[PDB]
Amino acid sequence: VSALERSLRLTFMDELMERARNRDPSGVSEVIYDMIAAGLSPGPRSFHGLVVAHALNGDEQGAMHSLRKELGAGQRPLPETMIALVRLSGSKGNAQRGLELLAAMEKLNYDIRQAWLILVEELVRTNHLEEANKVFLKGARGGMRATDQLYDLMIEEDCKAGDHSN
Amino acid sequence: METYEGIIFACGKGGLHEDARKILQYMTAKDVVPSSKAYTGVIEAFGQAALYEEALVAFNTMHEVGSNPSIETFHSLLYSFARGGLFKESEVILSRLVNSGIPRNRDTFNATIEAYKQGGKFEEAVKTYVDMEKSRCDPDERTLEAVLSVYSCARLVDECREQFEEMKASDILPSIMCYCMMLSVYGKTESWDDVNELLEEMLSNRVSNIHQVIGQMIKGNYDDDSNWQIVEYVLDKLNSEGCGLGIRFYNALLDALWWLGQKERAARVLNEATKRGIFPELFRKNKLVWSVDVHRMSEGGMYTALSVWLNDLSDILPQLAVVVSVRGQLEKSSAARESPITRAAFSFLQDHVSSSFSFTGWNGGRIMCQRSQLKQLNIVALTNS
Amino acid sequence: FPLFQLESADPDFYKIGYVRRVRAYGVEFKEGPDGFGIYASKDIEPRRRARVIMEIPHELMITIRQKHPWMFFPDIVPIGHPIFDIINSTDPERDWDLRLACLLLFSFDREDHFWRLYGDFLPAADECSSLLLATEEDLAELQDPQLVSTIRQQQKRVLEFWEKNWHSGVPLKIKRLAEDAERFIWAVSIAQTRCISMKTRIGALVQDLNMMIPYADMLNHSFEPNCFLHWRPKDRILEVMSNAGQAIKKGEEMTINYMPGQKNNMLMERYGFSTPVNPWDAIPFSGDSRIHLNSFLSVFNIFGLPEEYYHDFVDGAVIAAARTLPTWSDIDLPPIPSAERKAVKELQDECRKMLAEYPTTSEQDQKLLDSLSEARTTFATAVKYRMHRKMFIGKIIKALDIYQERLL
Ligand SMILES: Nc1ncnc2c1ncn2[C@@H]1O[C@H](CSCC[C@H](N)C(=O)O)[C@@H](O)[C@H]1O
């Protein structure tokens, strides 16, 4: 890794992260193709920026397409990419998609406790108490421990909804 | 179902990757499981625009939804990989076919032929030809056209004219291809007598109109504003069989025009082809990268594109001006360093703009030029013989 | 064919325990220049549950109630003894070590007490690393006015207590407990450096106790320990248990967490030592320049909640840096590299300014330690403390550099 390659990667990564921060996944795709033309191999960081850009403007299909580009490109997705995907699935209420992403995280030797908590909290926030309860119970029966705040939130919401069983 | 497949097939034939992608997302958003034919259509649509990664992603998604690959999907995959010269992907797909047990038809053989031709592996191309004749099946016009192109590229005039006189004996109305790279190969060795003797028969062409128009315009008789309109209508008429045929037609025409001394005519033909839709990856202009892609072009098409790319550079700054000589798995290897595309581009740039366009220390198939070297930089003289 | 092909501790040390139902499994006691330690005499195979390492009976301990009133378990103090009057006058909150020191002296004076024999293996005044035995010269090398002031306050409190309770008119049974002040100072130092606090149930009574446990104070401290203490109430035995499923190699030291979530300064105040991989150390930054917490964690593979950072170069120093570096988080907002480079440059400048504030460096401190031949234990302890702070700052600098490197 020369200083010239480092500077080119720095400029391209900066501009790509910029385009990801202004909710422009198409611009991130232009930057990725610019890296391809320039000979710079797209690492997990640029692709993570692409995934975040797709997920910021509530686009689940594009985010999963970017993850498919991850797996096709041969790069290992970052934990932040999977966290963004599970958060997007929870915001949209896609509990099964979040579970699939958690399984993929587990296959990639990652700690899925934080993602599980984020998914449960998002499902509760979006008012999907049934799927939130199912995901929480799956995690708890799997040996995973939740925070005190999440326990209290689950108990209070379930009892407010009249769901004594959960 | 029928509407989706029809739209996707039309987009794939016309090289409309964006429309096929939009249709795919819209129809997936309605909880509709895609069929194998629609997936094949979008895959071949992506391959027209040299977007190999998108086509591979779609092919990977094909198995995820339960849609198993078909023969048409493999045919599209080999054709897309052969257009770009990605022969490594070609043999990988061939191994996939051999372990899948599906018989190999003429499409696999000729796709391999032009995959090795575009990659510069002439010896492997003729070896695969002799293997194609060894087993079974009859080559069509496409196979002999591909071998004529590979013979013309690898400075083989004698075998070229032998195949020419052998193929025209079948009363097959020889196409624009044969004439085009025959003029190219005759201009390689300054065979002006052969060029004129071919053009004498070429000009009349009582049977077809396309040959007559192109033969008139190559000599310069159709360069006027009113006389270029006939060429424009014939080009528009030819733009109906698909971008798969359009790219080959433009490649042959550009090679013939460049190698017959008609550099300005080749430049104008490339310019009118760009607005048509052929070669969509040719140019990229932005604050970061100013790129020219030539991995899907021939030697003649590369030189015309490089000539007009250098001229546009001098008009004006991007952080980098790059040349995509080789694109694919060959980049991460020294094999692409020796490739005819890479060496030809390097020699052209070296003898035109001196020692300014250097190689990449990280990629084995790109020609590089930093912004600092751009600061110190009409460069190529385009004239008609 | 068979034909063709740190020192061991005093055997009496374990023998006096062994004859009194102390059992050590798979570990042996070793002694070095630093002090005693417990090491695995063989390869401990990781089992399904925690494995029993040592068993210390309750009757061999010196325990006092952590809360008023003061009741000792086992009750060694006779009714009407003046030592109870001395103990009962202490401050309930801050004077816990004085009561344990009084109990230790009383036990040392008892003929049938076990600690009369076990007390011969305690570190002496010249071997204990507690700062209560440090002079003004040693305290001057801490390079921390706060720690020095705290140590002076502790020493003044201990000496005031001894002067108040060990005057001329005390009975002979009390005067012989501590004839002169430094003996009581050493007793307080031993109590501070080896006391273990736990919630133990005896019979039907559940309470918190301050315990001087033999053979369990032998374990050394670690913030990533392989052993933990579990109290067995049915037979009144304290168990030392290795972590479940954690393989331990032959010769690996047995370590327990003396106290979790405590920085190096409090460790130096209480146990008289510090560690360079303290994952709770704090460096006071200005907070104007901040980096991305998520990227910092992902680059170094630090997972879990902020209270349970762990690693899948990376050690407790990197975790401490992540816990102390100025960080910003915006859920899923990525960081643009350009601001990160400037932020880490400013942070590195701050760290280098802090290093320049120190009169010397860390490598020269290590050289001074290697050339040291006539210095007390507290002298080397203070030198090691300041050197460890210097290495923590240097590790912060290197971590910032490599994080900015791997950001692309
Ligand atoms: N990790 C560590 N590194 C250096 N000293 C340590 C240490 N953990 C504990 N100590 C020292 O050991 C004492 C606890 S009693 C532990 C055994 C003691 N070293 C002996 O030989 O008797 C404390 O005073 C502390 O100064």
* Three state DSSP letters for chain B: CHHHHHHHHHHHHCCCHHHHHHHHHHHHCCCCCCCHHHHHHHHHHHHHCCCHHHHHHHHHHHHHCCCCCCHHHHHHHHHHHHHCCCHHHHHHHHHHHHHHCCCCCHHHHHHHHHHHHHCCCHHHHHHHHHHHHHHCCCCCHHHHHHHHHHHHHCCCHHHHHHHHHHHHHHCCCCCHHHHHHHHHHHHHCCCHHHHHHHHHHHHHCCCCCHHHHHHHHHCCCCCCCCCHHHHHHHHHHHCCCCHHHHHHHHHHHHHHHHHCCEHHHHHHHHHHHHHHCCCCCCEEECCCEEEEECCCCCHHHHHHHHHHHHHHHHHCCCCEEEEECCCCHHHHCCHHHHCHHHHHHHHHHHHHHCCCCEECCCCCCEEECEHHHHHHCCCCCCCEC
Residue of the CA atom closest to atom 19 of ligand 1: C35
Determine the residue of chain B that is closest to A71 in CA distance: B57
Taking contacts as CB-CB distances below 8 angstroms, the residues of chain B near A9 are: none
Residue reference for tokens 């054709």: B79
In this complex, the residue of C295, C332, C338 whose CB is nearest that of residue A56 is C332
Distances (CA, A) of B4 to A90, B32, B46, B114, C63: 31, 11, 16, 31, 82
3-class secondary structure, C29? strand
Question: How far is the C-alpha of C219 from the C-alpha of C228, rounded, in Å?
Answer: 10
Residues B367/B339, Cβ–Cβ less than 8 Å:
no
**From the DSSP assignment, how many helices (H) and strands (E) are in chain A?**
9, 0
- Nearest atom within ligand 1 for CA of residue C273: 26
Burial class (CB in 10 A: 0-12, 13-18, 19+), C245: exposed
CA C270 to ligand 1 centroid distance, Å: 11
Question: How far is the C-alpha of C209 from the C-alpha of C202, rounded, in Å?
Answer: 11
Contacts 24+ apart (CB under 8 A), C80-88: C81/C106, C81/C173, C82/C170, C82/C171, C82/C173, C82/C174, C83/C174, C83/C177, C86/C165, C86/C174
Q: Give the number of beta-carbon pairs within 8 Å between A and C.
A: 50
| Touching pair A, C by Cβ (3+ pairs < 8 Å) | yes
Residue in A5, A12, A45 to test binding to C, most C beta-carbons within 10 Å: A45
Distances (CA, A) of B170 to B66, B162, B173, C78: 46, 14, 9, 125
CB contact under 8 A, A33 and B284: yes
Quick one: CA dihedral A148, A150, A152, A155, positive or negative? negative
Question: How far is the C-alpha of A75 from the C-alpha of B108, rounded, in Å?
Answer: 31
DSSP state of C112: S
- Nearest atom within ligand 1 for CA of residue C34: 19
In this complex, the residue of A21, A43, A109 whose CB is nearest that of residue C333 is A21
CA distance A162 to chain C (A): 31
CA C220 to ligand 1 centroid distance, Å: 5
Question: How far is the C-alpha of C347 from the C-alpha of C188, rounded, in Å?
Answer: 42
C245 in the Ramachandran plot: left (φ > 0), alpha (ψ -120 to 50) or beta? left
Question: How far is the C-alpha of C400 from the C-alpha of C404, rounded, in Å?
Answer: 6
CB contact under 8 A, C312 and A83: no
Residues B211/B205, Cβ–Cβ less than 8 Å:
yes
Question: How far is the C-alpha of C52 from the C-alpha of B184, rounded, in Å?
Answer: 87
Ligand 1 pocket mutation pick from C6, C7, C34 by most atoms within 8 angstroms of CB: C34
DSSP state of C78: P
Question: How far is the C-alpha of B251 from the C-alpha of B152, rounded, in Å?
Answer: 13
CB contact under 8 A, A111 and C303: yes
3-class secondary structure, C198? strand
Chains adjacent to A (≥3 CB pairs closer than 8 angstroms): B, C
Distances (CA, A) of B21 to A19, B4, B33, B36: 22, 12, 15, 15
Of B89, B42, B92, B90, residue with least CA distance to B62: B42
Which positions in chain A have a beta carbon within 8 angstroms of at least one beta carbon in chain B? 2, 4-5, 8, 11-12, 15, 30-31, 33-34, 36-41, 61, 65, 68-69, 71-73
CA distance A62 to chain C (A): 16
Residues B284/A37, Cβ–Cβ less than 8 Å:
yes
Instruction: Supply A127's token pair.
Output: 């008012």
- Nearest atom within ligand 1 for CA of residue C35: 21
Strands C255-256 and C196-202 turn out to be unpaired
In this complex, the residue of A43, A78, A87 whose CB is nearest that of residue C298 is A78
CA B131 to ligand 1 centroid distance, Å: 79
> Which protein residues are within 6 Å of ligand 1, measured from CB?
C 35-36, 123, 129-130, 193-194, 217-218, 220-221, 271-273, 275
CA C128 to ligand 1 centroid distance, Å: 9
In this complex, the residue of C334, C338, C408 whose CB is nearest that of residue A21 is C334
Distances (CA, A) of C15 to A110, C108, C237: 48, 19, 18
| Touching pair A, B by Cβ (3+ pairs < 8 Å) | yes
Residue reference for tokens 């003996």: C183
Q: What share of chain C is helix, strand, coil (3-state, %, to 5)?
A: 40, 15, 40
CA C196 to ligand 1 centroid distance, Å: 13
Strands B289-293 and B320-324 turn out to be parallel
Q: Enumerate residues 6+ apart whose C-beta is below 8 A from B192.
A: B186
